[PDB]
Amino acid sequence: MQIFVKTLTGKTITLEVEPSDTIENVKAKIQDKEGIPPDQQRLIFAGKQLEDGRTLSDYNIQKESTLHLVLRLR
Template identity: 45%
Template sequence: MQIFLQTMAGKMISLSIEPSETIKSAKARVQEAEGLIASQQQWVWCGEKLSDRLRFEDYEIQADSTIDLILSKQKIQISIRTFDGNFLRLETESCSSVEDLKAQIEEASPGCFKDVAPEYRAWVFQGKSLEDGRHLSDYGIDSGSTVWLAARKTARGARSEASAEPPD
């Protein structure tokens, strides 16, 4: 059956596979055909990173499915900003999950964003709130990107959607 791999650059790669084939085997064929080092390929389908040792049928991947192909060794530098002026620059990987980014921010600068409790934090990039279970690459976050922290709290203390627009 045929599947598609979509790179972060938007390139679509067509690949014929057998459902019983391992992810590792398919990555080796992509390396041979496209020159992308197999050990640096991260394949993500429906928000889940695919394990090299499992087979396509283990994930119930169907014909014509599209899998995100991310090169894991691609380091990126991003900025984290709050609307009250706090700033942090981080180096991370483009295939990092939103949860990984949050943990990395806390580790790099414990207490830097303490004015907003974790449950009321909204991390925003280009007008979209970053959701757990997704990857930075899902949002097009790459080197030079700025992620904003906004509070999801109204004057009464109730949760609300964060403003997705940075200040002028």
């Protein structure tokens, strides 16, 4: 399925994902498209920070959901 990720500048990118993809997998996709190391990525959905080892399905993230990407040093 496809999800949206709104970034720092307000730019929104699309990602092609599966419900069983982990948050780690999603950050790896953002690194691919944007060049950002996953360790500097914080993904937010419904006001909560998302943990790497969990799946989109675990967080009830469905097709065309929008995540927010916050970037943090270390």
